[PDB]
Amino acid sequence: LDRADILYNIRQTSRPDVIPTQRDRPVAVSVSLKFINILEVNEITNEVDVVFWQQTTWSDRTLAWNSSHSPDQVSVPISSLWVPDLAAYNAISKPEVLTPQLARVVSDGEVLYMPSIRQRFSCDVSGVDTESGATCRIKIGSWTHHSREISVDPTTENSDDSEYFSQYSRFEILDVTQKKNSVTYSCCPEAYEDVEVSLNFRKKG
Amino acid sequence: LDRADILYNIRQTSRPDVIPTQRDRPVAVSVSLKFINILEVNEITNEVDVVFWQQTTWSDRTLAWNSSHSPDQVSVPISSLWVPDLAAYNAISKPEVLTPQLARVVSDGEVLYMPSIRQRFSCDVSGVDTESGATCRIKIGSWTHHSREISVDPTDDSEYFSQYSRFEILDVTQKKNSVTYSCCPEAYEDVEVSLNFRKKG
Amino acid sequence: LDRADILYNIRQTSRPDVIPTQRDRPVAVSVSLKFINILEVNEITNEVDVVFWQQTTWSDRTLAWNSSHSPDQVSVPISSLWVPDLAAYNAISKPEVLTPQLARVVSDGEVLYMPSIRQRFSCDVSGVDTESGATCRIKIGSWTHHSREISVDPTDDSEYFSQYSRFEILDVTQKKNSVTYSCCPEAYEDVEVSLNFRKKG
Amino acid sequence: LDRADILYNIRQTSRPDVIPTQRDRPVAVSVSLKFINILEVNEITNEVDVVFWQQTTWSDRTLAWNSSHSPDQVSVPISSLWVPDLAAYNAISKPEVLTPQLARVVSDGEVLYMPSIRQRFSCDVSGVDTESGATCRIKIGSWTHHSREISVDPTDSEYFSQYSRFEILDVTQKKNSVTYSCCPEAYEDVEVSLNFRKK
Amino acid sequence: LDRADILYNIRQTSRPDVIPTQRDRPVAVSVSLKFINILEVNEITNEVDVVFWQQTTWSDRTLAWNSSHSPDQVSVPISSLWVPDLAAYNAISKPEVLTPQLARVVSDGEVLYMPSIRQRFSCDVSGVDTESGATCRIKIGSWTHHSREISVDPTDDSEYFSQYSRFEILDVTQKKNSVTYSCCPEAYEDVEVSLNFRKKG
Ligand SMILES: CO[C@H]1CC=C2CCN3CCC4=C(CC(=O)OC4)[C@]23C1
Ligand SMILES: CO[C@H]1CC=C2CCN3CCC4=C(CC(=O)OC4)[C@]23C1
Ligand SMILES: CO[C@H]1CC=C2CCN3CCC4=C(CC(=O)OC4)[C@]23C1
Ligand SMILES: CO[C@H]1CC=C2CCN3CCC4=C(CC(=O)OC4)[C@]23C1
Ligand SMILES: CO[C@H]1CC=C2CCN3CCC4=C(CC(=O)OC4)[C@]23C1
Ligand SMILES: [Mg+2]
Ligand SMILES: [Mg+2]
Ligand SMILES: [Mg+2]
Fold first, then answer.
1. How many angstroms separate the CA of residue A69 from the nearest CA in chain B?
2. Which cysteines are joined by disulfide bonds (chains B, C, E)?
3. Contact present, B136 and B124 (Cβ < 8 Å)
4. Do B143 and C76 touch (CB under 8 A)?
5. D25 to chain C nearest CA, in Å?
6. Is E62 exposed, middle or buried (0-12, 13-18, 19+ CB in 10 A)?
7. Phi and psi dihedrals of C139, rounded to 5?
8. How many domains does chain C have?
């Protein structure tokens, strides 16, 4: 197989509308926000404007191919792939994607999609001008798929989600932590999972 | 049936431009606004900027399938479904959808669509800084389908309201109206949502 | 015929690129602006920001069907229909459509399309703070079709005007013009809508 | 032929990706800006916000039809036509098109396309508040086609809004040929000088 | 061959999703920024707003044709071509493309793509008001292709810079880097463009 064949095969047989589960085993999605720039902060309205790289990984075995004498990975337009329907629950603006909408697919079916996103959030900005800083929580999970269809999983301490933060920001990052949650909503009996990302930051000196 | 078959069947036989009226009864649509945030308020211009989850439900029996040895629900892109042509009659900005455009479909044909929407409204902001607060009315109904094609009915009032808003919700009431317009002999139904809110302490 | 058939037939045989001129008579288009809100006014720059419902009607006999054993009217996405290429000649922003892009089609081929539009205009704002008010003129006509292809005709001024606006409407008049442009020998029609309004208090 | 046949034929045989160079000759494009409004002006940043009608004409003989017992002209969505890849070289915002995207096509293959555009430009705003006024130059030409593929040629104050803060003193057009490092061939542009001032 | 044939052939056999690597050598991409304007600068937030022409060249031998009895070059919509997935790593707004999205393709398979882009960056603005000026670094490279798939290489600094800008360019230097990410073992290449500029007068 060459790249052209792999990409052709994926395009011709893609079901981007179909979550790649096998009932009742959920697709395990890992989500990790790499903060890049904090652009606007308003302590009066409790709103923040943020740029981050949304590292997103999951496995889709319908995409796998024999890697022998073939490339190990390809870049695929996300329009040809199923992609998890993640949403930021406390977002107050449309997510503005700043990067080419391509995912990286490995021959074993592992997918990495990492868009750079600019987006505005409603969160706690109180304390941003103090040395303790503000703690802004961003809640990300599947909009429509419950825990038996999509499970979302959180970084540990070992993930440094501030390692690409711009040195030229007015702001600086003190800490970034993730908390996994399961929530039940009135509409449905099943629980929905989310990752809660706590961004601890402050205005510099 | 597996998920892929259900979704394939729906996509291949979808008539998204066809209202699923059966027995000439109107399609019964339930609408309910869950307010999440109140972002900007202007008592001089009487304008408000709001984020809400628009809980929308109706039945489309053309989508039903067998719930034995099969999943009970699937997520479907709305581009493959008929969706009610609801509009907010006193909106002054385009509805900005903040969520993936997917609906949840149950095997009996019940559909739930619930986009998160940011939108600006012209409404009564007077009294926002008082104890009694302001009462802003939002009117939502079908743009083009009258009462014999679509009927609308309303379905913790701060259940999902952000604790970090400058504002707080005192009460939300959701009422049903029938209105006749000059163009048509028929009555058009809407839900009128009264949002009573005020600036925090 | 049922709804699904009518909509299928329209979609399958639609020529949205083709003006439905019958014989060599122009398509008669009626245009009428229902003002809903006046949101921003600037007397220094002579610009106004306005929300209106653009009531637009014309006949397309290629869409007609036998109304026996059939619905009387259907809602059709405008992408399946020819729609007149109307433009506001003194607009200074893109028209922002706030409503579902659907037209209402009667079995005799009558079409009604009525989007809610927010748009900014360059017009005379002088006198807005006086008792006489300002008179802002909005010029609407076909961008590319002359008077033998499209003719435009006008058809309570505050009927749907928001009671919460900073402004109020004194009068709305509509008159009809034919203009000849250097490019072409044929005349182009427009409707000129005069909005007489003033700041309250 | 009726209207529907002409439009069907055009749609079915349209090559909107293909410049209609006949006999190996450049397509002659005429460009003319009709200024309608001047909305914002900033003498500190040298930026101007402008609304204009971009009169654009050229010949595409692949579109011609026998006019006998047929309409002489039709309106065609530009998505069905080749259209010159004109750009404003000193623009600093995306062109915002305010009109239906239709061209007018005559039976001999002449095409007229005239969008109303609002766009922001970087140009010389100095002197806007004096009676000599400012002279803002707008440079428009093909982005990718050189002078043997597209040639541009010009062809006043007629539709300018009476309600603008500004007024037009004069509009002149010059025709330039420029060579760029990438290519040996010359690229043509029209330079439009807008002389205007505060009222 | 005529122009129409070349363009037809390219469109009919185009694989825009497929990087044109040959013999498992990376596609060599040349990137060069021609600065046209500096529109807004903020020394407090360290942000800059910039317009530049992104000169981008590479070879795609699948596009080559016999130039005998044929045009040497054509203009092709980029939607019909593979284009490198370059991104500005320190960009804080979406790239706003100001020019027709067309590339120039030579009969030997060389491609030149040069969009005019307006975009905002986070970079060092300190010293903009001094004689020494600020030095703003812009990092551009493939988003998803490593050094064995795409290699990037750089090619008057004020040549196309607008004479009417508040600012002036002192120097522009470009430098290739290889970076390894936690992501992946392979190294990713970028070009780092250093723009040394200052406030006029
Ligand atoms: C179809 O979209 C619905 C489908 C299922 C959901 C559970 C999680 N999700 C977001 C929050 C939310 C709901 C539904 C609800 O009742 O309230 C809030 C939904 C969106
Ligand atoms: C085609 O879209 C029209 C079709 C039918 C309607 C009934 C309610 N609806 C919104 C307001 C409104 C009208 C019709 C009208 O003339 O008055 C105002 C419409 C939209
Ligand atoms: C391409 O669409 C053209 C076709 C015919 C027109 C007459 C009315 N219309 C708007 C004003 C206007 C023109 C053309 C012209 O030369 O003057 C300005 C046009 C647009
Ligand atoms: C592919 O698009 C290129 C192809 C040919 C061009 C000459 C005119 N044009 C605009 C300015 C410009 C260039 C190319 C260049 O290197 O300098 C700047 C181009 C765009
Ligand atoms: C989906 O595209 C990913 C695939 C490979 C990459 C290396 C360069 N690139 C940008 C920054 C970046 C990553 C990957 C990563 O995990 O960290 C940061 C990527 C995007
Ligand atoms: Mg092969
Ligand atoms: Mg692995
Ligand atoms: Mg030939």
1. 32
2. 123-136
3. yes
4. no
5. 26
6. middle
7. -105, 115
8. 1
- Whether D96 has its CB under 8 Å from any CB of chain E: the answer is no
State the amino acid at position D53 in one-letter form: W
Six-digit token pair at C51? 């929300």
- Quick one: which of D121, D161, D137 has its CA closest to D40? D121
A122/A136 Cα distance (integer angstroms): 8
CB E35 within 8 A of CB E195: yes
Phi (first) and psi of residue D167, to 5 degrees: -145, 150
> Residue B74: beta bridge partners?
B105
Asked if A45 and B39 count as a contact pair (C-beta separation under 8 A), the reply is: yes
Is the C-alpha dihedral spanning E99, E103, E104, E110 positive or negative?
Answer: positive
Q: Measure Cα distances from B9 to B13, B22, C119 in Å.
A: 6, 20, 42
Query: E183, A112: Cβ pair inside 8 Å?
Result: yes
* Whole-number Cα distances in Å, A148 to A109, A186, C60, D68: 20, 17, 52, 69
Measured in angstroms, the resolution is 2.3
E–D contact: 3+ Cβ pairs < 8 A: yes
Interface residue A144 vs chain B (CB under 8 A) = yes
Query: D113 CB less than 6 Å from ligand 3?
Result: yes
Rounded-to-integer distance, Cα E1 and Cα E70, Å? 5
Measured between beta carbons, the chain E residues lying within 8 angstroms of A37 are 92, 122
d(CA E123, CA E138): 8
CA distance linking residue E106 with residue E72, whole number of Å? 6
Strand pairing partners for D190? D140, D175
Letter string b/e over residues B144-182, b meaning 16 or more CB atoms within 10 A of that residue's CB: bbbbebbbbeeeeebeebbebbbbbbbebebeeeeeeee
In sequence order, which ranges of B32-126 are alpha helices (DSSP H)? none
- Output Rg (C-alpha) for chain B, integer angstroms: 19
The CATH code of the domain that includes A170 is 2.70.170.10
D164 CA to centre of ligand 4 in angstroms: 36
Min distance A165 CA to chain B CA atoms (Å): 25
Coil, helix or strand for C162? Answer: coil
Q: Are E107 and E70 in contact (CB under 8 A)?
A: yes
Residues near ligand 4 (Cβ within 6 A): D 143-144, 180-183, 187; E 53, 55, 103-104, 112-114
- For chain D, the C-alpha Rg in angstroms (whole number) is 19
Residue showing tokens 């809110």 = B197
Domain span at residue D125 reads 1-199
Span between the terminal Cα atoms of chain B, in Å:
56
Phi, psi of D130 (to 5 degrees): -105, 170
Quick one: CA torsion of A89, A95, A98, A104, rounded to 10 degrees? 50
Q: How far apart are the CA of A115 and the centre of ligand 5, in A?
A: 9
Burial class (CB in 10 A: 0-12, 13-18, 19+), D167: middle
Indicate if the alpha-carbon torsion angle D162, D166, D171, D173 is positive or negative.
negative
Beta bridge partners of D150: D27
DSSP type of residue E55? E
Q: Which of C127, C200, C201 is nearest to C169 (CA)?
A: C200
* Cα–Cα distance list, C102 to B143, C98, D38, D166 (Å): 8, 12, 35, 40
Instruction: Decide if E103 touches D, using CB distance below 8 A.
Output: yes
Asked if residue E172 lies in contact with residue E130, where contact means CB atoms within 8 angstroms, the answer is no
Burial class (CB in 10 A: 0-12, 13-18, 19+), E72: exposed
> CA dist A183 to A188, A190, B169, Å?
11, 9, 23
Q: Would you say how long chain C is, in residues? A: 201
**In this structure, are residues C147 and C189 in contact, taking their beta carbons and an 8 Å threshold?**
yes
